[PDB]
Amino acid sequence: GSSGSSGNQNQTQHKQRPQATAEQIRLAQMISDHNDADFEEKVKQLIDITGKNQDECVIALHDCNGDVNRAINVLLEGNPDTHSWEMVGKKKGVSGQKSGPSSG
């Protein structure tokens, strides 16, 4: 019903921690716009090297700054479950999931 709406929890057993479910999709979707051959070639290198979700590779690479190596260092492992460090931690949204409530 479009009045109460009270589920339990929207989480898919695959990845832990937030910022790696919907955002990502949008992230890669947003990062896609701004891309270059250089970074691209690197991204591929990350996949070929590691082989992690491209999107993630694109994020990792970027997150790093644009270093396949640096990325790998992160991709391989990453932050040791850190509370807050690097990057701005803020939430945003226009409504909810990208696409859905449009018409019908």
Side-chain angles (χ1 to χ4, degrees):
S2 164
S3 39
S5 226
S6 207
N8 291 24
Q9 62 188 31
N10 249 302
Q11 231 155 2
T12 61
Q13 214 217 79
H14 260 120
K15 71 259 276 108
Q16 260 185 281
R17 249 184 158 186
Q19 302 222 251
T21 281
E23 225 96 60
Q24 192 221 285
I25 294 153
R26 265 243 258 186
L27 291 200
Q29 163 140 8
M30 285 206 263
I31 285 131
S32 182
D33 282 312
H34 81 86
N35 252 55
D36 288 339
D38 303 281
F39 175 91
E40 272 191 303
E41 246 263 69
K42 287 207 179 215
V43 158
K44 278 174 81 116
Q45 258 250 309
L46 279 161
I47 277 171
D48 251 48
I49 293 150
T50 70
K52 299 284 207 147
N53 302 89
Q54 191 201 275
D55 296 301
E56 292 273 41
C57 305
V58 169
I59 301 146
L61 194 44
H62 163 114
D63 233 317
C64 257
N65 259 323
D67 240 86
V68 157
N69 319 104
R70 298 295 186 159
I72 290 146
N73 249 278
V74 182
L75 273 156
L76 285 163
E77 290 239 277
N79 298 96
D81 297 353
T82 191
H83 232 196
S84 210
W85 256 105
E86 196 179 36
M87 204 204 125
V88 172
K90 197 184 213 104
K91 283 197 174 148
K92 204 164 93 223
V94 52
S95 188
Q97 68 202 43
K98 47 156 261 287
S99 203
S102 53
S103 302

